[PDB]
DNA sequence: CCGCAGATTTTTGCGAAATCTTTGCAGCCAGAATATAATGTGTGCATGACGGCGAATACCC
């Protein structure tokens, strides 16, 4: 929830370039959990960064 | 008007290949796996008929 901004803004790049919007965020959102059950701090990475690949692939 | 020849009919035989399932192959394809920097924003709003009409809140008397 503390992350759908960044979807929303991520897939606003892409509204202009067709598709709705709505589903680019839905898709993005889904991105965004798979990220969250998949990230870790051990790493030492920003959470966003990791969250931007996988949303750009959803 | 009848028996054989031309034409027509009867019968046995071999090659050919195609099709159905199985096996090996290659192009197509799906999910699983990895950790680059980026979160209150974009956005289309495109816009000058005309008559009828009930529904939905407002407001005077």
Redesign the pocket.
């Given at each position: 929830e503390?992350?759908?901004?960044?979807?929303?803004?991520?897939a606003?790049?892409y509204?202009?370039r067709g598709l709705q919007?709505l589903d680019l965020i839905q898709e993005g959102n889904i991105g965004l959990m798979?990220?969250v059950d998949?990230?870790?701090?051990r790493?030492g990475?920003?959470?966003?960064?990791?969250?931007?690949?996988?949303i750009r692939?959803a």
């Open positions: 503390a992350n759908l901004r960044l979807v929303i803004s991520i606003k790049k509204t202009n919007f798979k990220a998949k990230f870790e701090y790493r990475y920003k959470f966003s960064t990791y969250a931007t690949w996988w692939q």
